[PDB]
């Protein structure tokens, strides 16, 4: 039941594809939510081009987090 977790972590990226899907994501985990999800996903085994697209999307989510809960 590991691909329940891999599916959870990729489907977590689909869950963040909207700007109006942030609010309850972004109380905890942090601005680095999808970055750490990508860490766990690389460790689970993922391709490099998916890694590049993710490493872009997670940075975008970090900016969209700092935009509302930054200093």
């Amino acid at each position: 039941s590991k691909e329940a977790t891999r599916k959870y972590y990729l489907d977590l990226f689909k869950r963040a594809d909207f700007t109006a899907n942030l609010p309850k994501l972004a109380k905890k985990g942090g601005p680095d939510r999808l970055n750490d999800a990508l860490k766990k996903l690389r460790k689970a085994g993922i391709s490099e081009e998916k890694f590049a697209e993710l490493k872009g999307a997670a940075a975008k989510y970090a900016d969209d987090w700092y935009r509302i809960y930054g200093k």
Partner: protein
């Protein structure tokens, strides 16, 4: 420990498979999980953000899954009646030995029911002990049977009182109807104990949906005296008494939880450490021999009747409505499937 991490941790618990829950259900109710974790952390003044592995295991592998299971049992209980059809209280019986988190569990379980809008009432079997004079008279009938001198073994329980108390609890289906919870004081008469005076008892109003019923002896069944006589001669009377316990408790408990321990001797261990912690901190602490006598007197019943639970199960139990929690030496749920 971020939300995602906790998810993973929750999914690796030994009870996720056993309460019927799934990774999707965990993902869909992770908000409920984390709010329950917050509430339990405050209930123990824990930190959430500074939890060691034992605390995390209790909260997210032990307490919350059991709360989820119990609330599902009440859900399926109340789904069986119609509008204006009054709902009888659901009595969930906890069959676990002494000092195995059994007591603090129900304290945690009861608390979450209060938070989530189900009035909760807790009754230990020990609250139905024979009063001090009745206990003394029970002793006098068996002057040569030590196990009946003091409390806990079969006989020390005021069964007519237990039956009336359990019957009166059930009629809390409307508001206004009440019932006093009989509290038992364990320190009366030098530490022997007597029932708390009935004018000091907590009282529950309204319709109560869940009742939490704990005891070291719940689920124990009448055995053939041949298993009994060889484990201890002083159990044969205690065996014959529990035949009359089949009918005052097992009728009334619908859902069950059986904390199952690895080796009964743990009880002694678990007792001593506690008292040792008291004696180390310089507090009223039973002596080593005192604790040894105390535990070694309930041990004759454990070795007789614990085997039956693991083999068959509790007596007035339905197999789909019994949860088994195997705890390790640290009172934590074992991943024994």
């Amino acid at each position: 420990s971020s939300v995602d991490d906790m998810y993973d941790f929750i999914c690796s618990g030994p009870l996720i498979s056993k309460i019927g829950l799934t990774p999707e259900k965990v993902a869909e109710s992770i908000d409920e999980w984390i709010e329950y974790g917050l509430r339990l952390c405050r209930l123990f003044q824990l930190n959430q953000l500074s939890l060691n592995e034992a605390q995390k295991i209790r909260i997210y592998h032990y307490y919350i899954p059991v709360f989820m299971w119990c609330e599902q049992e009440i859900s399926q209980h109340s789904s069986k009646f119609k509008e204006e059809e009054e709902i009888p209280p659901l009595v969930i019986g906890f069959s676990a030995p002494q000092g195995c988190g059994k007591t603090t569990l129900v304290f945690a379980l009861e608390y979450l029911f209060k938070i989530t809008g189900r009035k909760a009432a807790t009754m230990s079997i020990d609250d139905f002990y024979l009063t001090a004079e009745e206990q003394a008279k029970l002793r006098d009938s068996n002057p040569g049977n030590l196990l009946l001198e003091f409390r806990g073994n079969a006989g020390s329980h005021d069964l007519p009182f237990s039956v009336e108390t359990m019957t009166a609890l059930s009629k809390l289906t409307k508001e206004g109807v009440k019932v006093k919870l009989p509290r038992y004081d364990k320190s009366a008469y030098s530490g022997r104990g007597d029932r708390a005076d009935p004018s000091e008892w907590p009282e529950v109003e309204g319709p109560l949906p869940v009742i939490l019923f704990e005891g070291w002896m719940l689920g124990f069944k009448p055995l053939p005296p041949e298993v009994v006589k060889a484990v201890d001669p002083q159990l044969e009377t205690i065996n014959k008494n529990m035949e009359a316990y089949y009918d005052a408790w097992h009728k009334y408990v619908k859902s069950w939880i059986v904390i199952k321990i690895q080796d009964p001797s743990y009880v002694y261990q678990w007792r001593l450490q506690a008292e040792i912690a008291m004696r180390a901190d310089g507090k009223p602490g039973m002596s080593d021999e005192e604790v040894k006598d105390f535990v070694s007197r309930y041990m004759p019943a454990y070795k007789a009747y614990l085997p039956t639970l693991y083999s068959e199960g509790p007596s007035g139990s339905d197999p789909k409505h019994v949860l088994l929690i195997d705890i390790d030496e640290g009172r934590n749920p074992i991943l024994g499937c």
